[PDB]
């Protein structure tokens, strides 16, 4: 049976991916966006988390209700639906399918009575929904193609006939006076006056009439809402703004994040001179700022997938979680060590994590022109990764959180003017050599002591995904896109096999016994094969609702996992099939995964960036 232990995911691209739940005495203090679903988790890690999943594609907008409700928005698929989530129920409350294209932004009224939803494409509508029943005003039209960046509500002017909604769309600010009693929307464009900046975040004052807009130019533009005009501008945090939050108590203060990790306190009063001086610096680019733990922490998020807790009484910085950013492609386990898990990504970053507490043991970083880490292999003191440029880089594994040092690199391992990027790296049992598979179907065995090429093995004509080395100087590939897989020999001579199916493969694993080989096909079929047999022993049809993308295998040969585009990982007995345990927790198709060297433990990764840890007992 699969038990979900922890999910590490954060949509670092979004501004406000993570957000606190104010006055949350119960569980689920924080809510993060990682992909299709929402990770509603406690402030402290190593605690159970819930997965609010009701969408079909990525989430484009996330909104808090200042305590009481969450909201996530869809994207494409003709079902860009605004879904309201309840804290206590943890279930969808309202499903507004009124936007033909992805919902650009969504926000909640300061009194948690109104709901603003804005689309951008082919129907640009400022829908205002009541907490009871449905919508109040149809739209105000806007214009297609105008990217609605962010939105905010005025705490003041809540007389039932007025509700001032500020909307930043590109370099345009608009104040929308909404009469919900009559359901009318009047949109006044703010007179810029040579002030053209892209607003990352918007926030009204406590008493209103002063709207602070943080821009990418590290500036907060203060605009007079009453006159609907830009009043002034002050630099706040070098690097940008990101997240802008009203001060927990404040005189006129306003906490500002920065892309440099700085957190400062900007006040409108205090003259034209600022002389920036942050009171706290977090690692990475700040995108979220809130307050929780009974308003004792600042709960600052990061574009790098990080969540951090900043104490208010002593400014103490404590990390909470880290999320690998990008499309995660491979999971590796040290040959004997179950405490360290390596996760690669299409972004040039590999995270080695301590599975005991899901902390970042070490990080491997490479420039974007080096391709993406499409396969990974962990060692007691090394991380070997095959990238999108065909190169295989081995980095010195570090501890405590640091950039790893590249010990060596096999250059141009798989790049032959028709396919670049090595996939499905594997290490020899005990450790003797390194099996690698190219994007075009070439298998290559590399010495480890001298890094010299020992075998080039080219029969498969398409992508290799799922190579595996047997127990004695032999190996086998999977060869996606050509629906066949062949067991080979290191003497540069294929040993028979070459079993062809009917559909293209996606992954292949070898059991503890040297005769059992599992393959997974896009036909959502899991095929079991005996090396001594010319035909697959059996096949399980419709293993997943959608295409299966990855297959694993326990080192004992008892069970093998299967992850697919249905976001659900299942476990199947090696010989009897069946479902030992299955669960859907990734907010994306599952791309790769790895069993622990011991009985307990399965680590899977998704295309959005979500890493899910599993206890098999």
């Amino acid at each position: 049976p699969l038990v979900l232990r922890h999910i590490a995911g954060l949509n670092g691209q979004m501004f406000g991916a993570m957000r606190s739940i104010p006055n949350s005495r119960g569980p689920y203090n924080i809510a993060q966006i990682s992909g299709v679903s929402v990770i509603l988790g406690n402030e402290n890690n190593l605690a159970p988390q819930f997965t609010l999943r009701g969408h079909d594609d990525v989430i484009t907008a996330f909104a808090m209700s200042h305590g009481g409700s969450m909201l996530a928005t869809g994207q494409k698929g003709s079902n860009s639906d605004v879904i309201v989530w309840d804290v206590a129920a943890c279930a969808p409350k309202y499903k507004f399918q009124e936007h033909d294209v992805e919902v650009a932004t969504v926000s909640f009224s300061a009194d948690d009575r109104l709901l603003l939803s804005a689309s951008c494409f082919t129907d640009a509508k400022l829908y205002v929904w009541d907490m009871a029943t449905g919508k109040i005003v149809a739209k105000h039209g806007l214009e297609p193609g105008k990217r609605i960046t962010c939105s905010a509500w005025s705490p003041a002017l809540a007389n039932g006939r007025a509700y001032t909604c500020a909307t930043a769309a590109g370099e345009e600010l608009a104040l929308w006076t909404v009469d919900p009693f009559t359901g009318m929307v009047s949109g006044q464009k703010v007179v810029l006056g040579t002030v053209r900046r892209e607003y990352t975040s918007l926030a009204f004052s406590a008493d209103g009439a002063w709207l602070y807009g943080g821009t990418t130019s590290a500036d907060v533009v203060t605009v007079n809402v009453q006159r609907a005009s830009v009043q002034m501008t002050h630099p706040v945090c070098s690097g940008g703004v990101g997240a802008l939050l009203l001060s927990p108590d404040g005189g006129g203060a306003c906490l500002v994040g920065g892309r440099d990790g700085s957190l400062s306190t900007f006040n409108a009063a205090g003259g034209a001179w600022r002389e920036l001086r942050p009171f706290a610096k977090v690692p990475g680019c700040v995108t979220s700022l809130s307050l929780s733990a009974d308003g004792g922490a600042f709960l600052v998020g990061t574009a790098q997938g990080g969540v951090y807790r900043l104490d208010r009484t002593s400014l103490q910085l404590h990390t909470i979680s880290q999320a690998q950013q990008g499309q995660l492609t491979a999971v590796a386990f040290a040959p004997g060590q179950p405490e360290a898990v390596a996760t690669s990504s299409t972004d040039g970053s590999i995270y080695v994590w301590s599975t005991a507490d899901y902390t970042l043991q070490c990080r491997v970083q490479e420039p974007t022109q080096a391709g993406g880490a499409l396969c990974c292999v962990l060692t007691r003191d090394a991380v070997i990764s095959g990238w999108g440029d065909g190169n295989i880089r081995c980095h010195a594994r570090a501890a405590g959180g640091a950039t790893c040092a590249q010990m060596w690199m096999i250059p141009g391992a798989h790049a032959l003017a028709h396919s670049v990027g090595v996939t499905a790296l594997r290490l020899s049992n005990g450790g003797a050599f390194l099996l690698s598979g190219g994007m075009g179907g070439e298998l290559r065995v590399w010495d480890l002591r001298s890094r010299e090429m020992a075998a080039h093995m080219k029969m498969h004509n398409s992508r290799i995904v799922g190579a595996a080395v047997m127990a004695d100087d032999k190996h086998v590939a999977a060869a996606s896109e050509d629906r066949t897989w062949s067991l080979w020999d290191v003497g540069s001579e294929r040993v028979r096999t070459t079993w062809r199916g009917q559909s293209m493969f996606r992954g292949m694993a070898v059991s503890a016994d040297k005769v059992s080989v599992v393959t997974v096909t896009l036909d959502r079929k899991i095929q079991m094969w005996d090396v001594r047999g010319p035909d697959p022993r059996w096949t399980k049809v419709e293993a997943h609702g959608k295409e299966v993308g990855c297959v694993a295998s326990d080192h004992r040969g008892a069970a093998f996992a299967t992850g697919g585009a249905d976001q659900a990982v299942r476990v199947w007995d090696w010989r009897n099939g069946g479902e030992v345990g299955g669960a859907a927790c990734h907010s994306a198709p599952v791309a790769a995964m790895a069993f622990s060297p011991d009985d307990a433990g399965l680590v899977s990764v998704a295309l959005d960036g979500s890493t899910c840890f599993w206890q098999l007992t």
Partner: protein
Amino acid sequence: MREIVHIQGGQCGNQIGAKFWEVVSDEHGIDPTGTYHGDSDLQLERINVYFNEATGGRYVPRAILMDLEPGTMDSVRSGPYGQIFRPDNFVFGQTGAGNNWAKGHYTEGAELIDSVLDVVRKEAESCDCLQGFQVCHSLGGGTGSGMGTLLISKIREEYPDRMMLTFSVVPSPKVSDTVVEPYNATLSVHQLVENADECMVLDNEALYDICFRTLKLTTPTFGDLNHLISAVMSGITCCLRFPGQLNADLRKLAVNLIPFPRLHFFMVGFTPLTSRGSQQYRALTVPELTQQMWDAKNMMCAADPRHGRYLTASALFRGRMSTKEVDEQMLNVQNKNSSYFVEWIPNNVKSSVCDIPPKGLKMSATFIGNSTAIQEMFKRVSEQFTAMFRRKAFLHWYTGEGMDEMEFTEAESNMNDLVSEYQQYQDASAE
């Protein structure tokens, strides 16, 4: 390590320079604050070509802004990337040139030119090695054209060997903004011929045509035109800033483009310009980029190359591309359109390849064409200038600033001589 000193002149030049610096900072991962947030080594590898390092991680553009009216650079400072520029590099007067080239070149430009050259010399002396200066401005504007020509003359005097690149917005053929556009353009072309080593002609109506036909935008403001100009300005120098499979600097482009020193005016174009509707439906291939590049609609100059003959043409491609594909495509284009290419130059194509495509684009290609088509642009400008000068309309405004009437005749004669050279190499026969 080959530095470039950027200068913006006039309102149009300042806006174009602000957009260009925004684009370059986005390409290098520089936020409006000067700090690097790009997460790529190559972005910082050659950042010194345009930027200088401050006390911290701040990167200050090597840009110098000129104007006679302070409002334009107030807007520049308040724009998205107004805070990267060092405040000492904003050189401003108090009374703007009333669209008067004479005011911007003789009376009011004389006082401010000392400060402008001081800032330019300060920026140049800090450079390790200087590739040269690029000046972005508009022909047909008072302060822009006047101060730009004066500064180009001064920098030519000070640094003869250093490269001079100019992005001049020539007044548009059909719809003219100001009345004195022919006068300012005629006076400025005379200076650009003599001083500017390399010059690019841009027309706002050509930009409107390309952005309405290819980009299919509905309400294109000046920001979009500035964005296209910035794209070309970046793409011409991306080989300096990024590794290239076959890299080519500005001097290499000038050497392979300019057959004779006076014929240094080029029409430029950027590919691939795709409408938002057809962005997915198109395919980014070397043949597609070449096909869109050699289309006359892609040209940012009013003159269409079909009428003239391509003296030379450089194509700077960006991305992971086949040099064989590039060379074959351009040779095939030359063979197919041998009528439009000069006979006494066997190869009219200077192909360069850079390893780093612009952000968002898998592939790109900027084009710099030296063809006799620009002859018709000069002919039209002269056709307006002669009509105005025959009756001496608005002549007193330039005369009262202290420049002789004979200067108009000299400029017109020089420009007509340039037209004659273009026609001569249009209809020159081999052997």
